[PDB]
Amino acid sequence: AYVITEPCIGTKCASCVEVCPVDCIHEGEDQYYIDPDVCIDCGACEAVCPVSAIYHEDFVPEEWKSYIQKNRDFFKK
Ligand code: SF4
Numbered sequence: 001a002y003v004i005t006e007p008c009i010g011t012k013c014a015s016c017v018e019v020c021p022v023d024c025i026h027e028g029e030d031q032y033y034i035d036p037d038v039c040i041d042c043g044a045c046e047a048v049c050p051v052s053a054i055y056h057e058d059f060v061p062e063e064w065k066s067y068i069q070k071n072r073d074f075f076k077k
Pocket residue numbers: 004007008009010013014015016031032048049050051053054
């Protein structure tokens with residue numbers, strides 16, 4: 001699954017929204033949060049993010065693997 005990280009934070013972004021096949025893009029008020037566990041491993045949202053920052057959970061660096069955990073955790077609650 002593909003997940004947001006850090007160069008995405010920025011008080012009410014709107015791009016990775018009405019594109020996701022399975023509507024698994026959720027706000028953490030400031031920024032969107034992808035449920036990796038609902039995301040069907042596509043590549044649309046990244047291509048849409050006008051920064052290029054959404055990477056595979058595996059690919060996101062260990063420093064930022066914290067966000068993969070957070071993204072997981074958000075909805076596993
Ligand atoms: S488009 Fe990019 S910057 Fe915006 S919320 Fe999504 S991932 Fe974050």
